[PDB]
């Protein structure tokens, strides 16, 4: 039996709205409804993993499991194997696989991050799954974030407290936040970012969302406007939203938008709004290809509509030679020349490299670089030909070419990382120089640059 170099992987997101769900909900994992839709010809063919995040989720653990596995069970015939399942409060992840995949996932990982202090603290947050799936790793975070049209700030500021404190994935990459732990991140949920436009608009944007004239809604949609100005997302994918916003319907319907102020709404005002969100970052050269992104029309429990979305992804196999793993392959190596970073810290420390990778038998520290000032006020820090040469635990240039190398530049005075990024090793020749390049970021914001030459020997 063949170990796969693709899987589809199905997110979905629900905000359930305390309600429980219909007896039908098949439309949500066979990707029908509105926007990027799933062809009927692939009706019976299951997906490798089904990752579900619920918001608002009133059902125990124990009732929404049977409820899935039963759904799954009827589109394919096939009984999904639980992975994890992860609740906090009533923000839900459950992770499902093909029975098949059972001895290919391991080191599966859950955590939450509950946002905000105190009055905010107390039902908003985020909940997450990793694992490793053959040679590739996975992660999966369910956030819920803060609501209300005029909190976008908040909400933002709930992204950067998610992705620093969510513990999954590796912990020997100390240096690196979940948005560089995995191969394919997927991050969704309700995230609450509303389409910015005046209250009294109200039933001009009910008229658009009739006609599907979407453009000049999404042109004031929080979460575009604000990844656009680089506020929260910084490095993430989003498919192109082609279905109607997801949130507030009245409930038993899909006929009509519950936007007016009342008692319990807190007197606000709930525009139709995309708050329902699917977004992806997978390392440079990896395969991810979206083929669905939609909301389901015939799942009316609840005020906001569920949202599907599938992706094809590339996965690598847990690769054995004679030598790696636990020895290198001396016939492998991958020197880092010409490198520099540019920084945009105003601080004078020397800075020293982390280079971190399955690859390597264990992460690998450069000396420190050699600091001089950019043109226009940066930091540049310069490493010369002075990196490491990274000895790889397997030189097959079928495994190496789909490595990937994180780096961190540290304070030599404090060990802080100062700026995280990812190199591809997918390069177009081996034994040939050719030019790098990441961004470089800390807690998911824009903090520098890395660029330089790379050399990568396999025993090709
Ligand atoms: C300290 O305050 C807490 C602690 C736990 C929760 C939960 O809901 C748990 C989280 C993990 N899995 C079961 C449910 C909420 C608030
Ligand atoms: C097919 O879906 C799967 C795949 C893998 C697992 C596991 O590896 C379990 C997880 C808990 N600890 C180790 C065993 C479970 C379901
Ligand atoms: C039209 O509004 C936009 C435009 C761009 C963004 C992005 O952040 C990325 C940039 C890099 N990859 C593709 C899109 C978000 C909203």
Known sequence: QPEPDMITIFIGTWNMGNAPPPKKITSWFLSK??????????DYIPHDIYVIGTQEDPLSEKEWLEILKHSLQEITSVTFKTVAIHTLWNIRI???????????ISHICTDNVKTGIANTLGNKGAVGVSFMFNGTSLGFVNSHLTSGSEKKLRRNQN???ILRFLALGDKK???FNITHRFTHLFWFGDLNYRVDLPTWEAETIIQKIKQQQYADLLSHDQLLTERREQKVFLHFEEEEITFAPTYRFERLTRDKYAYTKQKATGMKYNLPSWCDRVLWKSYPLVHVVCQSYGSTSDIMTSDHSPVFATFEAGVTSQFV???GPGTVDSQGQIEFLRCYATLKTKSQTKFYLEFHSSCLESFVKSQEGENEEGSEGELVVKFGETLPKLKPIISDPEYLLDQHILISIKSSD?????????????????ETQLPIYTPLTHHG?????????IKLQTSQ
């Open 159 to 161: 992204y950067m407290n």
């Open 94 to 104: 459950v992770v499902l696989a093909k029975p098949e995949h059972e001895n290919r």
């Open 33 to 42: 409804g509105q926007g990027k839709t799933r062809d009927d010809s692939a």
């Open 321 to 323: 030679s004679k030598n």
């Open 173 to 175: 990459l100390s240096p």
């Open 414 to 430: 404090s060990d802080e990382s100062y700026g995280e990024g990812c190199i591809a090793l997918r390069l177009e020749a081996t």
């Open 445 to 453: 914001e824009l903090t520098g640059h890395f660029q330089g030459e």
